[PDB]
Amino acid sequence: GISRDSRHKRSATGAKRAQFRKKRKFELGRQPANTKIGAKRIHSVRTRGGNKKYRALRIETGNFSWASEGISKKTRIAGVVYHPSNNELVRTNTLTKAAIVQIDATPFRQWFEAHYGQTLGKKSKNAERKWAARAASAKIESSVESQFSAGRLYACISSRPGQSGRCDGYILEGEELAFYLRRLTAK
Amino acid sequence: ELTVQSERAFQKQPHIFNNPKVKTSKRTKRWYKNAGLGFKTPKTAIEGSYIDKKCPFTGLVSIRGKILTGTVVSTKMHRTIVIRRAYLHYIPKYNRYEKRHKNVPVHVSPAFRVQVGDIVTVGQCRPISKTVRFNVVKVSAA
Amino acid sequence: ARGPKKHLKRLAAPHHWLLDKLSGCYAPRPSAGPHKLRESLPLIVFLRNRLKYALNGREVKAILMQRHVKVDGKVRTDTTYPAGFMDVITLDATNENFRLVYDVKGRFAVHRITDEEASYKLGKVKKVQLGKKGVPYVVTHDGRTIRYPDPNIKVNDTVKIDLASGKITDFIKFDAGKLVYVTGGRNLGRIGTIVHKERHDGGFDLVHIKDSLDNTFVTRLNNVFVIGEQGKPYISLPKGKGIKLSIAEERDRRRAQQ
RNA sequence: CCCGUCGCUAGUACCGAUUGAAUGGCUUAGUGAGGCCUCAGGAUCUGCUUAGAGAAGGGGGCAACUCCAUCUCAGAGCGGAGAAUUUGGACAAACUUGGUCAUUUAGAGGAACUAAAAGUCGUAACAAGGUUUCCGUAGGUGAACCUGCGGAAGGAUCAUU
RNA sequence: CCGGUUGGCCGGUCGGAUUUCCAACGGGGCCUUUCCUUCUGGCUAACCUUGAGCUUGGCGAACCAGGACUUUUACUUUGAAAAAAUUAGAGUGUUCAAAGCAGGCGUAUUGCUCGAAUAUAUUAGCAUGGAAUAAUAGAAUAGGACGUUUGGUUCUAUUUU
RNA sequence: UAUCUGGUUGAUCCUGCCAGUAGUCAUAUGCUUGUCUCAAAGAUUAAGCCAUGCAUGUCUAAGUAUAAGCAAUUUAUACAGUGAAACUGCGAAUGGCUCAUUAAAUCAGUUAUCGUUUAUUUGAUAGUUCCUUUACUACAUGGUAUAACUGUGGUAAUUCUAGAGCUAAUACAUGCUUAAAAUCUCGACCCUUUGGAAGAGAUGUAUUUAUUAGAUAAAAAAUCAAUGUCUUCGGACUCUUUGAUGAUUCAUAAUAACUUUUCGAAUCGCAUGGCCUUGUGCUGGCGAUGGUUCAUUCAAAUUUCUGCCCUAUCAACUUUCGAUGGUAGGAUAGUGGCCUACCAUGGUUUCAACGGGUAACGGGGAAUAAGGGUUCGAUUCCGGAGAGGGAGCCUGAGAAACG
Ligand SMILES: [Mg+2]
Ligand SMILES: [Mg+2]
Ligand SMILES: [Mg+2]
Ligand SMILES: [Mg+2]
Ligand SMILES: [Mg+2]
Ligand SMILES: [Mg+2]
Ligand SMILES: [Mg+2]
Ligand SMILES: [Mg+2]
Ligand SMILES: [Mg+2]
Ligand SMILES: [Mg+2]
Ligand SMILES: [Mg+2]
Ligand SMILES: [Mg+2]
Ligand SMILES: [Mg+2]
Ligand SMILES: [Mg+2]
Ligand SMILES: [Mg+2]
Ligand SMILES: [Mg+2]
Ligand SMILES: [Mg+2]
Ligand SMILES: [Mg+2]
Ligand SMILES: [Mg+2]
Ligand SMILES: [Mg+2]
């Protein structure tokens, strides 16, 4: 079908190769996943040596990591806002790796309350001791906390959904957030 | 060397995370390694800001296999040069030799600056591109 | 093409088996085992062509199925089981014990050993690493994995393996003045003491080696097997003791005894 | 010293006007089977949630009223597996209409060359071959060839202090 | 100066070899202006030592290890890693031979035993010795080599307080 | 085994070819043909076409047996011997054949995977699952089928099979039973600074993502910010841990979550002991098959360097439809224009690119040679390719498979 070989291309000198061999199976290629959003639907692919591979079609939630905070929560995905390879993936809401998405951000604000006791945006003694002891770490950044006021965080997909089935990511932070923010707010 | 951030994606080294909470000197974590085989890692790799995924020093490639030497005859690609290896081929009937040559496309890191006429030594890596399998490890002529 | 090969033509078999070029199109292809199929000896060619205890492969199978032969203490009723270097072979009828060691001509010898010596074997460590849950292991040259080894054991050393348990009795390090066995290459079968080793970062470390008649040679580090200190070896060496007399001295020695 | 035109026989290649049919690699536009991935689809099969209604047997009546019931009617459900069929996609055999080139045939006619041939007309070359021969170039002529211009000696002159 | 091979030597047993020996060929050590680079340790190699002639206290390859500075080739020597069969070739009376890799020897009843060598195999890659022959580089608007200097910028970073 | 000889002339010496001469794991053909050993054999033309038959099946003490099969018992009223069918499991990807295609392709020698898949073999290796965790239950052992079989049939015909009635598993789906400790996280409450807890929850392995460690050339002092189980509370502060490689973000470990939730034995044969408060109590041998991960072996897929016949009456070729590179993604077992999106304008060539031709599979090798060479290699071994031509795929560890 889709072949993954180099014998069908021209040489570096530019000559046309002759057909040495029929298409072998160990050099095959398969159609893309084009993972949409909503109503999770994972198919299986049997691959070389047994060794199952999970095509996610139409994934709904994901596990997203806050790297400066060292946690990760299972959060719902709102939609893709940027893709460095293609704008039609942003339009059609496809989820690949390196896609800039919006996520729900409510588990992160629940963890931030339960861990630090200050609310983002705008009772027991043990919790008071814990929240006082980890003080001067409850001042995260301006950009992320303004997103927390708006209830949608910017994340980047670090997983490959067509291969593992999962759509994992990390929250955008720092200079990478500023770069993609200039990309997004660019007219 | 006028911007780093030219592409549509954010150029960064993978799994090298700079914590936004802390504030120190030594502005960013930069990963670098020594490529081995007695090749010295250049200071422009250690102190620079370029990203260059296919670099033998800061990037994710490893040098193993042949070490070759050629002369640069083309620099017109981006981060890629063509070297020319000249050799003599012996013909046993006439009991003498003839001049032959091959052209090798090699990857060049932004730590190195080559022009046409420089002699370079290159190290074999995994396939970089359709034709490139070698990577510049030391430029030591002009 | 299309998958693994299961046959082995004669004239493609390893030359040190000494299988004659007539009497059949095929040779016994060694099955997958602890040794590489080139540096191995199947039990069919050991029982039939070297010990002459059988006349057919059918008789070798008849010997094997009554569990007579056992190799490294395990029974192994397989016709083409690869017996390799330093394996012990026990024939309990006749109470015989062999060790596969090379003669200096480069072929496997019929080296009869005693019953105390059949209780162990030497192995050259091929890699030391940390397995799962941080447990270290070594891998010997016949693929035995031994957990919790001594921390001093690095690669290219020899460990003495117990063969009732899989435990390590002692070990010989790698430096100058060590008695080695050459297993591989042109000098296969020779025994000499190591004089020095050449670093050669990037591939194929060489080692220089001189026998008891002060003849030096050099070998890759892949083909060297340390067997002890100079004087005593840790095993019994076969007849000849790895000396490599030249052909002139060999016909002179043959005209002595003739 | 047996050949320049013309002539006979045999053979070998070439040019063929010929709008003749047959192959094949590509190539232009239009279709495009099959499986595979995918969007649906839902013949059927099945598992559990109610228990209203319909023949016999216990705890109060030892006389309508409360639990199991052999089985259906089914609605107040959740599924799961799933066949035909079907949407898009990539892969793509093939098909129809051209158009190029690499290959054959027929072919009015030419157009030569070779061999063999007791032919026809002359005598160009070999002797200063009876106008020295040969070269390049141009014109002319039944045929060899002739003539102009420049050259050569392989000339018939190694030569006139 | 010193050992290395072939000799040579009382022909020592009547064609075997103890070297005080002549000779030829082939290496190594040192000096002669001769840098043919050496930053850290154990170990000291030669070694200062040394006992009345086996003693307690000097130079790192003499043995390695660690890092640091490296003009670049062609050529040639040695070696490793190069599949058997086939080629050349050693042993062996297949009855000879082409072959084959067998076989031989005993009290032939308990048996014993030698073999299955070796060489060639380019060009390329690899390790090594040589450094003649051919190339290549270097100090010239010094930006040169040195350097116990006399300093200043600037970068790590240990053990420690 | 470093050799020539006949033919131009009336004769001569040369140039020069023709002719002879010897061989051929070079074929064919003619004539002739007693013996022994040894032996090629539909390559060339047509990788043209095929009547017929065979060439791939397989059982052990050890997966399933109520054959309405055959046997003889005497252990055994659940089975137990031999054994058709059938299910399950493996194998059918090896071997054998041929040489059409193919000219930097295959191939050969030499590298690499620090760039990946690997049934099997061999060696290691899994107290964590009572998923809401006082029973919601089966763990001295849980649920369905369905084949063979029995019976009723269709079609001219095939290794076609339909409806009905049975019944198994090492099939298919499902599911529990074992030590502890230690460490984290929440914390009722005693309390408040010096703060303590009782309790509950979580911690196997696999999947995915983020983060952390995985160090290291050799010695002393200064206020300081908190000091550190005991402190002469200014301590001696060592003894505080760190494997490999030339080289890694490597091996391995840790933290936070993820999972549509992988695996973590409801299996079989012989032997039948040990100890008892004697229950069909507890306990226990040698195997067989399966199983996660690592290593090994048999492999595979890519890959580095150099090397190929004739032709310039082939001098420029490649590049909207990938040509050369860059960045992201996708796909793959994995690397890579392998493909897509965007970007740049590259890449090869007289040292012969690109085209054309090959009566071209490559190599080990063969024949003939004084030395150097020339010609051949379809064909006993190694590698490749193909199964009338193309293309597509299922199953499986492995096929773009042609019995
Ligand atoms: Mg076998
Ligand atoms: Mg006439
Ligand atoms: Mg005239
Ligand atoms: Mg005349
Ligand atoms: Mg005249
Ligand atoms: Mg004249
Ligand atoms: Mg003449
Ligand atoms: Mg004559
Ligand atoms: Mg001739
Ligand atoms: Mg085959
Ligand atoms: Mg195992
Ligand atoms: Mg990529
Ligand atoms: Mg790219
Ligand atoms: Mg062909
Ligand atoms: Mg042919
Ligand atoms: Mg073959
Ligand atoms: Mg095939
Ligand atoms: Mg056919
Ligand atoms: Mg096919
Ligand atoms: Mg067939």
Q: Do C1 and C112 have their domain in common?
A: yes
The length of chain A in residues reads: 187
Shortest CA–C1' contact from C16: which nucleotide? E116
Within 10 angstroms of residue B122's Cβ, the number of other Cβ atoms is 26
Q: Which is nearest to B41 in space by CA: B49, B50, B33?
A: B33
Q: How far away is chain C from the Cα of B37, in angstroms, using its nearest Cα?
A: 7
| Amino acid identity for residue B46 in this structure | I
- Residue pair C245/C253 in contact by the 8 Å Cβ criterion: yes
Q: Which residues of B touch C202 (CB under 8 A)?
A: 37, 67
d(CA A135, CA A128): 11
d(CA C38, CA C29): 10
The pair of three-digit structure tokens given for residue A37, joined into one six-digit string: 């959003």
Q: Do C13 and C44 have their domain in common?
A: yes
Q: Do C60 and C129 have their domain in common?
A: no
Strand partners, A113: none
Shortest CA–C1' contact from A54: which nucleotide? F260
Which residues make Cβ contacts (< 8 Å) with residue B75, sequence separation at least 6? B81, B114, B115, B116
Q: Do C181 and C209 have their domain in common?
A: yes
Domain membership of residue C252 (yes or no) is: no
Mutation target to probe the A interface, by most A beta carbons within 10 A, among B6, B7, B8 is: B8
Q: Do C17 and C66 have their domain in common?
A: yes
- Residue pair B41/B33 in contact by the 8 Å Cβ criterion: yes
Q: Do C149 and C213 have their domain in common?
A: no
d(CA A122, CA A144): 13
Q: CA–C1' span, B25 to F252, in Å?
A: 32
Ramachandran region, residue C162 (left: φ > 0; alpha: ψ -120 to 50; beta: rest): alpha
**Is the CB of A9 less than 8 angstroms away from the CB of B5?**
no
Domain membership of residue C216 (yes or no) is: yes
3-class secondary-structure state, position A162: helix
Q: Do C188 and C213 have their domain in common?
A: yes
Domain membership of residue C194 (yes or no) is: yes
Which residue's alpha carbon is at the shortest distance from the C1' of F247?
Answer: B36
* Residue C159 alpha carbon to ligand 8 centre in Å: 99
d(CA C68, CA C96): 11
Q: CA–C1' span, B98 to F22, in Å?
A: 39
Q: Do C12 and C71 have their domain in common?
A: yes
Does the CB of B2 fall within 7 Å of any strand E atom? no
Count the domains in chain C: 3
Strands of the C224-229 sheet, one edge to the other: C216-220, C206-210, C191-198, C178-182, C224-229
Range of the domain at C143: 121-171
Q: Do C98 and C84 have their domain in common?
A: yes
| Residue C134 touches partner B, C-beta closer than 8 Å | no
Q: Which residues of A touch B5 (CB under 8 A)?
A: 179
How buried is B119 (Cβ within 10 angstroms: 0-12 exposed, 13-18 middle, 19+ buried)?
A: middle
CA distances from C142 to A175, B5, C121, C147 (A): 54, 53, 11, 15
Residues 59-88 of B with CB under 7 A from strand E: 69, 88
3-class secondary-structure state, position B138: strand
Q: Do C202 and C112 have their domain in common?
A: no
Q: Do C126 and C110 have their domain in common?
A: no
Structure resolution, Å: 3.0
3-class secondary-structure state, position A115: helix
Q: CA–C1' span, A15 to F322, in Å?
A: 13
Q: Do C140 and C51 have their domain in common?
A: no
Domain membership of residue C13 (yes or no) is: yes
| Amino acid identity for residue A163 in this structure | Q
The pair of three-digit structure tokens given for residue C216, joined into one six-digit string: 């030096």
d(CA C197, CA C219): 10
Domain membership of residue C17 (yes or no) is: yes
Range of the domain at B138: 1-142
Which residues make Cβ contacts (< 8 Å) with residue B125, sequence separation at least 6? B54, B56, B61, B62, B63, B64, B65, B107, B133, B134, B135
Bases of strand E lying below 7 A from some protein CB: 63-65, 68-70, 72-75, 79-86, 90-91, 100-102, 114-118, 122-124, 126-128, 156
The pair of three-digit structure tokens given for residue A106, joined into one six-digit string: 């409510």
Does the CB of C205 fall within 7 Å of any strand E atom? no
Mutation target to probe the B interface, by most B beta carbons within 10 A, among A137, A177, A179 is: A179
Q: What HEC string does chain C produce? A: CCCCCCCCECCCCCHHHCCCCCCCCECCCCCCCCCCCCCCEEHHHHHHHHCCCCCCHHHHHHHHHCCCEEECCECCCCCCCEECCCCEEEECCCCEEEECCECCCCCECCEECCCCHHHCEEEECCEEEECHHHCEEEECCCCCEEECCCCCCCCCCEEEECCCCCCEEEEECCCCCEEEEECCCCCCCCEEEEEEEECCCCCCCEEEEECCCCCEEEEEHHHEEEEEECCCECCCCCCCCCCCCCHHHHHHHHHHCC
Q: Which is nearest to B22 in space by CA: A176, A155, A172, A137?
A: A137
- Residue pair C102/C188 in contact by the 8 Å Cβ criterion: yes
CA distances from A2 to A5, A8, A44, A60, A140 (A): 9, 12, 19, 29, 48
Q: Which is nearest to C121 in space by CA: C244, C31, C34?
A: C34
Q: CA–C1' span, C149 to F127, in Å?
A: 25
Count the domains in chain B: 1
